[PDB]
Design a binder for this molecule. Structure first.
Ligand code: HEM
Ligand SMILES: *[C@@H]1O[C@H](CO)[C@@H](O[C@@H]2O[C@H](CO)[C@@H](O[C@@H]3O[C@H](CO)[C@@H](O)[C@H](O)[C@@H]3O)[C@H](O)[C@H]2NC(C)=O)[C@H](O)[C@H]1NC(C)=O
Ligand SMILES: *[C@@H]1O[C@H](CO)[C@@H](O[C@@H]2O[C@H](CO)[C@@H](O)[C@H](O)[C@H]2NC(C)=O)[C@H](O)[C@H]1NC(C)=O
Ligand SMILES: *[C@@H]1O[C@H](CO)[C@@H](O[C@@H]2O[C@H](CO)[C@@H](O)[C@H](O)[C@H]2NC(C)=O)[C@H](O)[C@H]1NC(C)=O
Ligand SMILES: *[C@@H]1O[C@H](CO)[C@@H](O)[C@H](O)[C@H]1NC(C)=O
Ligand SMILES: [Ca+2]
Length: 595
């Protein structure tokens, strides 16, 4: 019941109230509460935050302190004992394509972003965290336990920086720490267009009144486009190969070049915008640049919503889909569309879906060259392999023909992410995504595994047998209690992902609830949802129902053979058909006439 109008977002965005378009920042979606779902604001809390001192200090910070009478185990040790494996044999998903993983990162990047605070103009602190492993202020290092192979090569810890929080983004006082979400909570294609009016303008091609997005002028892809280079130095993408001099791509989301395949889909979406705009120019010659931009932006936003809710989510949630996300009944403005803090860790279920290699396939879907199959760790912040080694076509073919990694309780996260992660600030391929996630759970003030179990209306195990029944695994349950000593202290990330998957889905009971509650809210609480009457005309909606990710590939690449259902495991040549068998997006109903 204290400071409720706090924060430090964009000082000026007034509502048009009659505009048929979304705001870049995400304001004016809810008319009663204008800033609901907007960017640069605190993540929603579904349960009260849990800190060591109940305000901002994470569990694990102080040696002498306990959580419920027990020490919290080092994140890297939880990683070493539970999360890791060596044998990549027989871990693939027999009915999920690599796109299934890839679309998850796209949707995620559209919904949430808690940025780290590493910021001072020039700093002694960046050094103080990395070189000397000194815990203090925003520095919260991930220590190596005894007998870690990384003691011998990497030092005593992995540098880790606490995420930004609201109100004085600089320092602190009362209530609990709330972390910022730097993107719009709506599934509104923020990753293509930006969440700031500043950035959203720089990505646009304002040189001509054609409503196009800016493209790369130095490099091309068989006559097709790339996002422009991000020319801020130092560049993580230039670092990995100083000979190539190929920088990171510049999109609406700042993580767009984190991996080769993420940059691949960012390029497809950027291409689709221009393809839509040039089509809308033909049909409507009198339309100015702004309408061409906005109208295309609106179509692509719906595209991402249709693909997510029709094609992706049912195969994630499975039998739980209908329980949490019932048929659409119209816009409910009493629904909180805000992304919760816990969703940002719930969605991280996909880090266990990431395989150890990325393939490049040719026009006959066979290996493309002597170096066709590459280790994932060589592909973090790698733009040079796109631009200087064959374009995005052999990469897109790989997404369709290769499999995702299946979750296993014995084989959780691949070493390519668990030992050899690259991060943009630093220089080694030696970070641990699993250890980072668990440290981030604590940084963000997450309640334990049982608090969420209670929140989702599920049983709360207290004993080994109770946990053995839930996890349906004696070893995993024993290994978790050996570290956590109680099911109350188990970090949400590791707890949720250890549960056996629901029927026809890829997350367990707890995650299905957490994910299911959120996706429902962002859909029900969005005024510009594609099915909401008045957002699109009836004829427009009949066009948008026939879109597919297959069609996206057909219109925007020189790939000619695609599967009809791209999110499932397909084999060449049987499951693949010519692009002419795939329904096109008809833009006829967008043609407007004067009289
Ligand atoms: C190789 C591909 C990927 C790489 C290299 C990668 C890397 C990362 C990194 C470094 C972070 C920051 C973690 C933190 O500081 O808390 C992150 C966050 C996250 N990742 Fe990924 N990721 C990948 C794919 C995916 C996929 C496929 C999904 C889902 C299907 C996903 C879901 C998430 C979510 C929800 C967050 C937190 C977003 C936020 O709220 O800030 N990631 N990822
Ligand atoms: C913003 O939009 C303008 C106008 O659409 C872009 O300018 C155009 O850029 C294209 C592609 O580089 C040029 O077309 C080229 O045509 C020549 C001759 O046909 C051909 O040899 C090239 O291979 C290529 O197809 C064209 O010169 C140019 N047109 C105009 C009106 O100047 C511009 O690239 C966009 N700017 C950004 C930053 O995205
Ligand atoms: C792979 O899994 C998908 C996902 O369930 C299966 O696709 C289903 O196909 C049936 C028709 O046989 C439809 O009624 C379902 O709606 C589909 N599921 C969804 C929600 O997409 C498919 O059966 C599996 N494919 C193979 C070859 O095993
Ligand atoms: C750094 O990038 C360059 C590309 O700029 C890579 O070198 C190319 O590799 C292929 C295959 O050997 C050759 O066809 C090109 O001629 C090479 N380019 C030049 C001019 O060197 C190189 O492999 C990358 N290096 C590392 C270590 O990743
Ligand atoms: C809107 O959502 C709220 C909160 O979940 C719910 O109580 C209410 O029944 C919904 N309103 C309508 C009319 O659907
Ligand atoms: Ca968004």
């Amino acid at each position: 019941s204290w400071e409720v109008g706090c924060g430090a977002p964009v000082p000026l965005v007034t509502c048009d109230e009659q505009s048929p378009y979304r705001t870049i920042t995400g304001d004016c979606n809810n008319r009663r509460s204008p800033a609901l779902g907007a960017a640069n604001r605190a993540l929603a809390r579904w349960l009260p935050a849990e800190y060591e001192d109940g305000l901002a200090v994470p569990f694990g910070w102080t040696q002498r302190k306990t959580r419920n009478g027990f020490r919290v185990p080092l994140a890297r040790e939880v990683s070493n004992k539970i999360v890791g494996y060596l044998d990549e044999e027989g871990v693939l998903d027999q009915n999920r394509s690599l796109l299934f993983m890839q679309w998850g990162q796209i949707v995620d990047h559209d919904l949430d972003f808690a940025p780290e605070t590493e910021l001072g103009s020039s700093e002694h602190s960046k050094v103080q965290c990395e070189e000397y492993c000194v815990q203090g202020d925003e520095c919260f290092p991930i220590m190596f336990p005894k007998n870690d192979p990384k003691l011998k090569t990497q030092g005593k810890c992995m540098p880790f920086f606490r995420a930004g929080f609201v109100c004085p983004t600089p320092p602190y006082q009362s209530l609990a720490r709330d972390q910022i979400n730097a993107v719009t909570s709506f599934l509104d294609a923020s990753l293509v267009y930006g969440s700031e009016p500043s950035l959203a303008s720089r990505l646009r091609n304002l040189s001509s009144p054609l409503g196009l997005m800016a493209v790369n002028q130095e490099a091309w892809d068989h006559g097709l486009a790339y996002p422009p280079f991000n020319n801020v130095k130092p560049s993580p993408c230039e670092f990995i190969n100083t000979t190539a001099h190929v920088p990171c791509f510049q999109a609406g989301d700042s993580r767009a070049s984190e991996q080769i395949l993420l940059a691949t889909v960012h390029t497809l979406l950027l291409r689709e915008h221009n393809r839509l705009a040039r089509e809308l120019k033909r049909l409507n010659p009198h339309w100015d640049g702004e309408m061409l931009y906005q109208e295309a932006r609106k179509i692509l936003g719906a595209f991402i919503q249709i693909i997510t809710f029709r094609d992706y989510l049912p195969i994630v949630l499975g039998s739980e889909m209908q329980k949490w996300i019932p048929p659409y009944q119209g816009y409910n403005n009493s629904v909180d569309p805000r992304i919760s803090n816990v969703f940002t860790f719930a969605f991280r279920f996909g880090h266990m879906e990431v395989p150890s290699t990325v393939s490049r396939l040719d026009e006959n879907y066979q290996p493309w060259g002597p170096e066709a199959e590459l280790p994932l760790h060589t592909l973090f912040f790698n733009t040079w392999r796109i631009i200087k080694d064959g374009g995005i076509d052999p990469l897109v073919r790989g997404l369709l023909a290769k499999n995702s990694k299946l979750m296993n309780q014995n084989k959780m996260v691949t070493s390519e992410l668990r030992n050899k992660l690259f991060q943009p600030t630093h220089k080694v391929h030696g970070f641990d995504l699993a250890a980072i996630n668990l440290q981030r759970c604590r940084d963000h003030g997450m309640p334990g595994y049982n608090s969420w179990r209670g929140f989702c209306g599920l049983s709360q195990p207290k004993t080994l047998k109770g946990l053995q029944a839930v996890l349906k695994n004696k070893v995993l349950a024993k290994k978790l209690l050996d570290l956590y000593k109680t099911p109350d202290n188990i970090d949400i990330w590791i707890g949720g992902n250890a549960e056996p998957m629901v029927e026809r889905g890829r997350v367990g009971p707890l995650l299905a609830c957490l994910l299911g509650r959120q996706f429902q809210q962002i859909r029900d609480g969005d005024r510009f949802w594609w099915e909401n009457p008045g957002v699109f005309t009836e004829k427009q909606r009949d066009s948008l129902q026939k879109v597919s990710f297959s069609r996206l590939i057909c219109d925007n690449t020189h790939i000619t053979k695609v599967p009809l259902h791209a999110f499932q495991a397909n084999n060449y040549p049987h499951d693949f058909v010519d692009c002419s068998a795939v329904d096109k997006l008809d833009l006829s109903p967008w043609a407007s006439r004067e009289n």
